[PDB]
Write a protein that binds this ligand. Structure first.
Ligand code: DCC
Ligand code: DCC
Lengths: 201, 195
């Protein structure tokens, strides 16, 4: 019964932290406030979350798992990969705009000077690999280059999302994030060089 | 002179003791000016790195424009530019890393000063001009915007390389960015290409 109590405890702390973060702000909330609200010692909080940002990483990982489930659903339903890609970025744009205040500090964590944490943030938010899954069918379909691995390409697109999202959130919140993300997709997918227009129907 | 004596004294201290460990006070003393005078020239320490970054960029800009005269093909100029950036980044990683972090400083006023000091995107956009002229680049995006996007990729790759994974061949990584963005991930196999 310890495992169940342990999972119950982590989940409660998470909820407590998220409620406080949403109502008072991430930076303004302290481990002491979180512990109090979750009904646990501060020491217990740190045992589950050694540093506050780890709560946000937990959150982003949850958001990503929901998107993954969505993408896999659309692909199994037979949606064209390119459309799923365009769908994913549209949903990423919407979710990022909606959760801007919590995602911003989480975004900086990927740029943490301490390599151990930058690494932990990275592994917790594998958007790059989700994108790779969508590219996979395109490759077997023969329309995708093969001089670069699916992994490195997906990672490149995920890096663009990250930079555009961070910049939008930190510096230009008034701009159209959906359009900006569509641009990254269109450029990396089709390239800057013009392509052949099909014979009209 | 002075702005020059300060900048040189700063770089020398950075070289001998490290950027992070060097202080405004020490720079002031080595440049022979008061802390007040130092700050008129460089309100904050990273501003010295921006100045450094600007001069390195000017040099690249120099090289670029002089290769375009010489008739070198646009795409070949781009490949050269990134081969030079790759080596340069590797050689001066210790000073460039704190400069890269400054580009994403939370203070919008500082992030903008950093962006404006390091206009790589615009340089890429000048090299692209002949392609635009040839009529071979899409028109739903400006050259400036496409250029900014390829510079962003450089930034991303370079910051990752210099801070977390120096093991990667930086030149091949930049060559990858150029290739994906210029050509796209979808293949180009038309039996009858234009031109
Ligand atoms: C060895 C060392 C080598 C060099 C080492 C260094 C290499 C650095 C590589 C790059 C690294 C980075 O950039 S990372 C930097 C992250 N930092 C930031 O983003 C800080 C941002 N700070 C700022 O102050 C912002 O940039 C502002 C406030 C100036 C706003 O930007 P901005 O308005 O886009 O600036 P500007 O230069 O005029 O850009 C004009 C383009 O944006 C478009 N644009 C603007 N608003 C809109 C809009 N609402 N809808 C559509 N389009 C818009 C314009 O139409 C035009 O696109 P179009 O019509 O032409 O298509
Ligand atoms: C809802 C909001 C969501 C939000 C979601 C937001 C997602 C944002 C994602 C991007 C965010 C950023 O990273 S922005 C950039 C700055 N931040 C960061 O980079 C985050 C921290 N970064 C890191 O820790 C590192 O860069 C890693 C972990 C990403 C690097 O991965 P790594 O394996 O160490 O390094 P990698 O590049 O893979 O190199 C492996 C070497 O071995 C080869 N190799 C090949 N296969 C393998 C293999 N299976 N295992 C190991 N190695 C392999 C590779 O070719 C390479 O050779 P060779 O290369 O020697 O030839």
């Amino acid at each position: 019964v310890r495992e169940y109590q342990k999972k119950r405890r982590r989940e409660r702390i998470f909820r407590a932290a998220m409620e406080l973060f949403r109502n008072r702000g991430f930076q303004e909330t302290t481990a002491t406030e979180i512990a109090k609200a979750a009904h646990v010692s501060r020491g217990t909080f740190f045992n589950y979350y050694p540093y506050k940002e780890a709560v946000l990483l937990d959150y982003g990982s949850q958001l990503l798992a929901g998107l993954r489930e969505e993408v896999r659903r659309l692909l199994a339903q037979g949606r064209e990969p390119v459309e799923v890609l365009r769908h994913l970025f549209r949903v990423l744009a919407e979710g990022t705009a909606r959760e801007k205040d919590l995602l911003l500090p989480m975004f900086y964590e990927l740029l943490n000077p301490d390599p151990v944490r930058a690494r932990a943030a990275f592994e917790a938010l594998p958007l790059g690999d989700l994108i790779a899954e969508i590219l996979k069918p395109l490759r077997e379909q023969g329309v995708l280059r093969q001089d670069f691995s699916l992994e490195r390409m997906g990672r490149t697109l995920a890096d663009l999302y990250f930079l555009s999202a961070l910049r939008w959130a930190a510096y230009t919140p008034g701009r159209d994030l959906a359009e900006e993300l569509e641009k990254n997709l269109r450029l990396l997918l089709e390239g800057m060089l013009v392509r052949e227009a099909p014979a009209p129907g």
